[PDB]
Scaffold this active site. Sequence first.
Site, PDB file in Angstrom:
ATOM      1  N   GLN A 126      33.057  50.755  32.060  1.00 41.44           N
ATOM      2  CA  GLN A 126      32.312  50.183  33.177  1.00 41.44           C
ATOM      3  C   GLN A 126      30.867  50.700  33.227  1.00 41.44           C
ATOM      4  OE1 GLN A 126      35.108  52.961  35.871  1.00 41.44           O
ATOM      5  NE2 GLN A 126      33.893  51.548  37.093  1.00 41.44           N
ATOM      6  N   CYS A 171      35.345  49.568  38.697  1.00 46.25           N
ATOM      7  CA  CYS A 171      36.720  49.788  38.251  1.00 46.25           C
ATOM      8  C   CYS A 171      37.675  48.674  38.720  1.00 46.25           C
ATOM      9  CB  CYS A 171      37.225  51.161  38.734  1.00 46.25           C
ATOM     10  SG  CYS A 171      37.167  51.308  40.553  1.00 46.25           S
ATOM     11  N   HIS A 191      40.100  54.831  42.983  1.00 46.19           N
ATOM     12  CA  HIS A 191      39.943  54.293  41.652  1.00 46.19           C
ATOM     13  C   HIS A 191      40.979  53.203  41.414  1.00 46.19           C
ATOM     14  CE1 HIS A 191      38.636  54.098  37.624  1.00 46.19           C
ATOM     15  NE2 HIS A 191      39.447  54.985  37.074  1.00 46.19           N
ATOM     16  N   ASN A 231      42.550  53.097  31.567  1.00 46.03           N
ATOM     17  CA  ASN A 231      41.362  53.381  32.377  1.00 46.03           C
ATOM     18  C   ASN A 231      40.219  52.509  31.821  1.00 46.03           C
ATOM     19  OD1 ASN A 231      39.688  54.548  34.352  1.00 46.03           O
ATOM     20  ND2 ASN A 231      39.723  56.606  33.446  1.00 46.03           N
TER      21      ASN A 231
END
Length: 215
Positions: free
Chosen positions: A19, A25, A162, A182
């Site tokens: 990102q 996110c 997150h 992630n």
Amino acid sequence: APDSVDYRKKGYVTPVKNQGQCGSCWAFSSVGALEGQLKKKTGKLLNLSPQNLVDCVSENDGCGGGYMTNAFQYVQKNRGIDSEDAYPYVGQEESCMYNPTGKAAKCRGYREIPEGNEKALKRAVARVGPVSVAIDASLTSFQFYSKGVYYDESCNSDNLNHAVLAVGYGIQKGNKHWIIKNSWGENWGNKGYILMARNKNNACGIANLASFPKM
Ligand SMILES: *[C@H](CS(=O)(=O)c1ccccc1)[C@H](CCc1ccccc1)NC(=O)[C@H](CC(C)C)NC(=O)N1CCNCC1
């Protein structure tokens, strides 16, 4: 449901993205869930565009945060989301410039997992595929993860900050975990992934804000 599932092995997961400086996110979590459903529906795996989401989901705050449910709703109302190629990720909010011609997928709703129910989250991962999840990733130990099944008693389940993607679950040397994708690059964690403690009392609030889109 089985005792271990890994969608990476099944080709439902695209490569790990980054990102950058933009706190988008939520956009990556959203596209990852959409990419899983797309693969399941058409047999094709494509990179969907997080930028389309950061620029166009007005109910969200671009790089300042947002939610996956609002993103799914926008895709459903917009009747489509572009491929990454048709709407490249820049890492900064710009005016909405959706290109109907580069449309790669669509969305017809979303379902939310019962708040805090990890058993239900497991079933969902097993039945539908990669699920978007929210966690508390504020601890230094998360930032510096490397090796094993992540568990930290300081993790706060009411402090979700997150958004990531649950791409499977299993057990590592007796430790049940969630395989998490992630969006901080391949250079972080284990090639961009982290294993998080499963059934350790909703660790980090992993089953508190889980959802997946319908196609
Ligand atoms: C994404 C989290 S992240 O990778 O930027 C991050 C970095 C280091 C540690 C932990 C997380 C994003 C960050 C938003 C933000 C940017 C800058 C300053 C404060 C916040 N978080 C979200 O988008 C988050 C998503 C889940 C569902 C909680 N939602 C969110 O932050 N907001 C705030 C604004 N109103 C909508 C929801």
